[PDB]
Ligand binder design. Structure first.
Ligand SMILES: CC1(CN)CCN(c2ncc(Sc3cccnc3C(F)(F)F)c(=O)[nH]2)CC1
Length: 496
């Protein structure tokens, strides 16, 4: 569960919630009201409430007096499973009891102010057996309507509406149990379905999809998402689903692999990590990288450390990658983001058993292309060209104001990859390998659908992102990037 996240509470409401309904060790997370784009962890300790800032400019969640994390769920799990780690003066803050949110605003199935006719239209056109939604009742204010489609324009399927009464701060379907929130009600009737008098089982199988759009209508959806904004509601609804992606990251936590990570808590999932087989004959199989498969593949990786440069080249070699996309400068804000893992132009360098020649560098407005020759030492016939695309104009914080630059870059990367017979996955990296990396990969995936299937294809931005996030933690870090993905897709369709 991710019930500890409250999307619409102020710091004052948070303070009162913890003092009146919480105990020492109670906590919640919320979006920052003082500075949008930031978050706050509000914790009760010794009868008083502490507010801890969580910053995210696009690379990771940075907790004050704490560590750097790929998601808020990974952050919460870490402190709930590793005590004495979160520090104030040096005092230890304990996250013991998540204070649960009753607000349905970020539920996939909740549609708030939506009319019964619009809901029946959506369920008829986009629905399937067990598709459901919850909307606010217009006739009886304060009440709700649960609409479910069941079946297989021939009457083989139908929509059933169930009234949800809100009586004295609790929710019920006219009889039986009375629930503290719409979520508890939905969860209960998902496990224990209501059976109609003549036998129809009202299965709440899956929330109705309202995010899948036809590509040609992107501008229309972007316009709707810009109204009071829709982008934030959709992004936060996708964020709520991150609790389902807490997969094991054991290999990255091993003592011998600790120093191979740029950020100690930003780790590759064990089930998709790139396993290195060269093996100098103790632990030579690890790199902080994951294979990203749509549904052309990618490897999403962090910026090299001085001690991981040789592992990076072994990975590029093993996977037969011919294209690298670097989305960061080596130094940003005086901080090292990626070490220079390539030789100077015309120079030849050995990185362990791998040999790399920088043949030629070409400078474009937004990027530099480096033509590299990679081979294994003592094996001349293993030589292959590796094209390194280094995007250099991405801002220090946030995203570019126009996606034109990124799109032209991605179009070039795509054409290079397509021209090379049996090229392995495209390697993509930034600093932590999750924010800018995930942003570039998601745009690439979406535009690839528009290339193949044309402008009448179906695209679903949150579905694509959830799919990439199941293969590497926190792929696409912020709301700014989420909106940038929609803007990029919109610009592409418009220039077609
Ligand atoms: C009005 C809303 C108020 N909450 C906001 C917008 N909206 C919505 N936004 C995001 C998601 S997530 C999603 C989407 C598609 C496929 N898979 C997922 C997964 F994988 F993440 F589960 C969703 O289901 N619906 C409908 C409800």
């Amino acid at each position: 569960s991710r019930r500890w996240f409250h999307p619409n509470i102020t710091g004052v409401e948070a303070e009162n919630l913890l003092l009146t309904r919480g105990v020492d060790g109670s906590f919640l997370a919320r979006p920052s009201k003082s500075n949008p784009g930031d978050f706050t962890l509000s914790v009760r300790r010794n009868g008083a409430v502490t507010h801890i800032k969580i910053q995210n400019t696009g690379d990771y969640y940075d907790l004050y007096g704490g560590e750097k994390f790929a998601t808020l769920a990974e952050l919460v799990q870490y402190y709930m499973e590793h005590h004495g780690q979160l520090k104030e003066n040096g005092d230890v803050i304990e996250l013991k009891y998540p204070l649960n949110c009753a607000d349905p605003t970020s539920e996939r199935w909740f549609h708030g102010h939506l009319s019964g006719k619009e809901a029946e239209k959506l369920l008829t056109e986009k629905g399937k057996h067990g598709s459901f939604l919850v909307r606010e009742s217009q006739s009886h204010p304060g009440d709700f309507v649960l609409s479910v489609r069941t079946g297989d324009n021939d009457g083989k399927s139908k929509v059933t509406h169930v009234m949800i009464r809100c009586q004295e701060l609790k929710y019920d379907v006219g009889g039986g149990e009375r629930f503290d929130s719409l979520t508890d009600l939905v969860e209960h009737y998902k496990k224990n379905p209501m059976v109609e008098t003549l036998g129809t089982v009202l299965q709440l199988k899956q929330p109705l999809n309202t995010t899948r759009i036809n590509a040609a209508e992107i501008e229309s959806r972007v316009r709707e998402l810009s109204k009071l904004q829709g982008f934030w509601e959709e992004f936060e609804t996708l964020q709520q689903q991150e609790c389902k992606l807490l997969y094991s990251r054991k290999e990255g936590q091993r003592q011998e692999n600790k120093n191979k990570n740029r950020y100690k808590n930003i780790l590759p999932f064990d089930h998709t990590r790139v396993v290195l087989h060269d093996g100098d004959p103790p632990v030579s199989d690890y790199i902080n990288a994951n294979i990203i498969m749509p549904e052309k593949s990618y490897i999403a990786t962090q910026g090299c450390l001085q001690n991981t440069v040789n592992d990076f080249w072994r990975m590029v070699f093993q996977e037969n990658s011919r294209v690298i996309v670097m989305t960061t400068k080596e130094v940003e804000r005086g901080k090292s983001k990626c070490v220079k893992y390539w030789p100077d132009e015309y120079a030849l360098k050995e990185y362990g058993v791998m040999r790399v020649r920088n043949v030629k560098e070409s400078a474009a407005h937004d990027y530099t292309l480096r033509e590299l020759k990679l081979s294994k030492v003592g094996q001349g016939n293993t030589e292959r060209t590796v094209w390194q695309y280094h995007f250099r104009t991405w801002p220090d914080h946030g995203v570019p104001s126009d996606p034109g630059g990124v799109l032209d870059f991605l179009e070039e990367v795509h054409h290079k990859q397509e021209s090379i017979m049996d090229a392995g996955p495209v390697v993509v990296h930034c600093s932590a390998g999750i924010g800018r990396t995930g942003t570039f990969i998601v745009i690439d995936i979406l535009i690839d659908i528009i290339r193949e299937k044309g402008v009448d294809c179906d695209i679903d931005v949150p579905k694509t992102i959830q799919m990439v996030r199941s293969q590497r933690s926190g792929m696409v870090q912020t709301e700014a990037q989420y909106r940038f993905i929609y803007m990029a897709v919109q610009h592409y369709i418009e220039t077609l």
